[PDB]
Symmetry: C3
Subunit: 335 residues, 3 copies
């Protein structure tokens, strides 16, 4: 019984970070309490000033990653401030019943609700808003994130041997559908409601105008590049609530990958590129062996480079000439 | 030898039902006899009266699911009535040789043929029409269904333990390519032949006008919703003969899933969303734990909600507060 | 240490063939030396004279398949002749560091470079050109191929039993983005540089004009069909550096398939259709049991039949009536 268990309260952190947590734990099941606040806002999504009338959990795309252990109970308070225009809710793919909790969390501006569910299956799971009659619009405008349910004894390889990560990052990939006017320029809308009709028309073409990691072209680059060191194992959580993607780490691999994102299944090893089904979250481990700047991208390279689905990982440490060596630098072809 | 074995005759049933069959069986191999009759017809495919010049096995999209056991022989009589305009045939992905049987089943209007093949591999397999020079048109117009070949000892989990379903449903998902006129309204064609040229032009854009379960937007909703009860394990067969899809059960999971649809492989567990490759059939088991109305959909939510790829499952039984509980109903945010 | 090991030199062969190699080997690790020369050229890609301003490794699409064993070192000399207009490089997905080697192989026309890397992971891996700021253009114009890294003890089934192929073919699938003029005819460009702007515009629509195996509609058909015999096991390597595809052998199966292309993972059996993620190479084994002409295709049938993603395999041997038999040839429906 959940009402017998101790409660803990978790403070969420903004992507691409994930809140502190244990992997393998000696602790027993708890009710883990979270709160998130919905924020509708206009966001700038590229280098040319294009805007999105966005909708977010906690002010970010994706929403923050919530981490519990299998057998824990997730207790979320969902707050929809009066400053918002739309009703919202939440559907946890990690949850059982009531359309993932959406039926029990319908909150108008000025309202909040509290949902509890048993996190009885291990894995990374999408959560998203799903208000009746406007589900795809709320999802594509930014309302999704990941629930990670770790097995109580941590991650395991196909032989049941232990696996771990030293650092975790969370990447949400967002296919955006920004309308254009007769002049061919992207439209800028005074309000969220006004963007609706034009946006549905673009959606129906199934062609995104932009595909971005974490809310903007280049969000995970420059000062905002992800970071690691040679010898460190990184977990890369990748969520795509609406559309397929194919993550790839340039100069790296997926050492151990759950592409369908469910930890009770054995992971695959040595992947060059993996596949995240639209409407799911997956997870890859990589241990860095070479220093330098990596790209982490959707390996539809048009989607990555033209449309925005690419980030960077800056890695410190010592170059290994055994793994790779420039034998002859670029030089004139011998006569 | 097939000519030594007893024969049985099976009466097919219309989707979403599947004809009565055993899973694990004590019976030995048989020649299992089926008949299907091709029907070309104009069908209404949405709520606004849009029509498709369709082509079907047995009058339905998808055609009926045929069920045999591994080692059985499938013996199909394929009938193309004189009331039809086009030649047709059948390609069983479950079969070996002669382009899946297409080369041996070329039937003009007024003709029939009988094909036998050994069902020597377990799984759900697409069958479809494939007449030379018009293969994609016949497939996208409705001519596909599933052959399920059950292992003789029934379904098994990754550890070789037994799995079963108490109820089976079959869902065919159809990417449709309906042309539009200068006025932007969908075209209605007097005949099947007349729809061809315009339809090929739409196909070549790779953008479906509609994506529907079982022949129509909302085919598996209302009076036609699928049904189950808490405690019942349902098999959901999903076929897509031309285009990728990503099935998801809202408020549920894929407890055991063969997404590539081949039962000799271990299934994955706890899936939120799985992946059916265009040109294949997959299979998922789910045991219901909560009552209420579920949605079963393609989790490209635009494809589901805007284009038609979504159905409903109405489930009876008792709510389980341990799995999910509304702690605080939606209420004013405390001052 | 690589500088302690013996060296061997390999002569590459044009697709769809793959250079002679051992599978399971008694040999120890070597530095395996390869050379490839970049050729930019205008190529005719369909039956109606449409041209592509193409870019190739060794004059072919795909580039040749390089085969080594796990633990070997790949040492590639990459030559960019002065007759070319563009800078190029190479990114091996099979390699670790320096963006797959791209950072160490930047060659202007008239230059060459030599890269060494440790092939420490088994599988089929994409290699492609990736010059900074023009990565997708170089890839979609033809600059990709496969590195196959065989395990030292050859291929294994899920139970660790030996698997092998008697013949290997390599298929690269290329989503092409050829621009059209106001008249709706495909544009023909005097130079590679001139094609750039228009091509980027087409790319951004995410809709290929053509999708071809090995450089042209019908490249693997007629005199150029692949060949086998009943009783022979064929390895089919399928690379797609930019876009998802779903290979299928009509009248056949994937007997053993690594769809994500990494041999340390167990293969799946009995596949009807498998999935190659954009930015990866996969591998399927099939042992022929029936003679005749097979099609090997992308089972988005529009992509196959309308856009060009289909080839043929002509197979010799004896028909097996146990696997498939025409019981009744097409005949008038009995009155
Ligand atoms: Cu919302
Ligand atoms: Cu969902
Ligand atoms: Cu037909
Ligand atoms: Cu087929
Ligand atoms: Cu290049
Ligand atoms: Cu790459
Ligand atoms: Zn570590
Ligand atoms: Zn049961
Ligand atoms: Zn052999």
């Amino acid at each position: 019984d959940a009402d017998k268990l101790p409660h803990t309260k978790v403070t969420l952190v903004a992507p691409p970070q994930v809140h502190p947590h244990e992997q393998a734990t000696k602790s027993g099941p708890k009710v883990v309490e979270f709160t998130m606040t919905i924020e509708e806002k206009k966001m700038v999504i590229d280098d040319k000033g294009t805007t999105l009338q966005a909708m977010t959990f906690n002010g970010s795309m994706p929403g923050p990653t919530l981490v519990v252990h299998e057998g824990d109970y997730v207790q979320l308070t969902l707050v929809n401030p009066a400053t918002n225009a739309m009703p919202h809710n939440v559907d946890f793919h990690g949850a059982t019943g009531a359309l993932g909790g959406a039926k029990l969390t319908n909150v108008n501006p000025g309202e909040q609700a509290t949902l509890r569910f048993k996190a009885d299956r291990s894995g990374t799971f999408v959560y998203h808003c799903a208000p009746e009659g406007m589900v795809p619009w709320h999802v594509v405008s930014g309302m999704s994130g990941t629930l990670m349910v770790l097995p109580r004894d941590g991650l395991k390889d196909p032989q049941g041997k232990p696996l771990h990560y030293d650092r975790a990052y969370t990447i949400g990939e967002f296919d955006l559908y920004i309308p254009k006017g007769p002049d061919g320029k992207y439209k800028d809308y005074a309000t969220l409601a006004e963007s609706y009709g034009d946006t549905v028309q673009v959606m129906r073409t199934l062609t995104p105008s932009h595909i971005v990691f974490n809310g903007k072209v280049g969000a995970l680059t420059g000062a905002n590049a992800l970071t690691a060191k040679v010898g460190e194992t990184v977990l890369l959580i990748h969520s795509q609530a609406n559309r397929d993607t194919r993550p790839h780490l340039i100069g790296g691999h997926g050492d151990w990958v759950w592409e369908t994102g469910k930890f009770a299944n054995p992971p695959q090893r040595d992947l060059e590129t993996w596949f995240i089904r639209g409407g799911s979250a997956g997870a890859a481990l990589y241990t860095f062996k070479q220093p330098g700047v990596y790209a982490y991208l959707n390996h539809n390279l048009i989607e990555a480079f033209e449309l925005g689905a690419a980030g960077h990982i800056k890695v410190e440490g010592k170059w290994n000439d055994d793994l790779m060596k420039q034998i002859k630098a670029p030089a004139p072809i011998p006569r």
